[PDB]
Ligand binder design. Sequence first.
Ligand SMILES: CC(C)(C)NC(=O)[C@@H]1CN(Cc2cccnc2)CCN1C[C@@H](O)C[C@@H](Cc1ccccc1)C(=O)N[C@H]1c2ccccc2C[C@H]1O
Ligand SMILES: [Cl-]
Ligand SMILES: [Cl-]
Lengths: 99, 99
Amino acid sequence: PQITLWKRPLVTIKIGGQLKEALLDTGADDTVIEEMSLPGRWKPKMIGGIGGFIKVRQYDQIIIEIAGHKAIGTVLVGPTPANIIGRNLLTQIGATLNF
Amino acid sequence: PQITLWKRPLVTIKIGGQLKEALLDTGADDTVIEEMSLPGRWKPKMIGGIGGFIKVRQYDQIIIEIAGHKAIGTVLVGPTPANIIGRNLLTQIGATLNF
Ligand SMILES: CC(C)(C)NC(=O)[C@@H]1CN(Cc2cccnc2)CCN1C[C@@H](O)C[C@@H](Cc1ccccc1)C(=O)N[C@H]1c2ccccc2C[C@H]1O
Ligand SMILES: [Cl-]
Ligand SMILES: [Cl-]
């Protein structure tokens, strides 16, 4: 689709067998989701936002469906104020910024 | 342009007669720039992201060019970790997300 920016660009995602709403975020290097369970090994990571850093769990090779489009990549899980789809997964669904 | 997301979507902006680098950020509601002088009066604002909130100065109706596209709108100034062009100005320059 073509998504305008009048409002936050929120879409439905399927991750870990769950449906969530998430923000398509070209400013985010990484994908960060609120607390949930994910399969496999993880390792801790610190990620920095406009108000400083938070600690998250990094899970690799996680399959996600983003507004109907499948991808695989790293997903960070922690106390984020918003579910965020970052560039690591936006590239995979073919998302571009156009003007 | 059509900007892919394999790297950060950084562009040159011009504000106050000076060129700066800034991030085109669909996850940002507002536009925030590192400390600089702007004309007129300012209003208080708090903006929240990962990590928490920061206090910024809100300046309205500021002339800014974004990748050569002219805009006039609200620019926040404060201790942001990065110059960010948010949706208030991305809409002015006609930007969309497409996949
Ligand atoms: C991976 C992670 C998510 C941690 N990245 C970021 O937070 C990066 C940080 N960098 C910088 C960085 C920081 C540290 C280290 N390297 C890089 C600058 C750009 N942000 C991306 C932003 O788009 C993130 C959003 C998240 C959010 C959306 C809605 C509600 C809460 C949080 C963000 O912070 N947006 C906020 C925002 C942003 C600007 C102006 C106003 C507002 C309000 C709000 O929309
Ligand atoms: Cl990845
Ligand atoms: Cl591509």
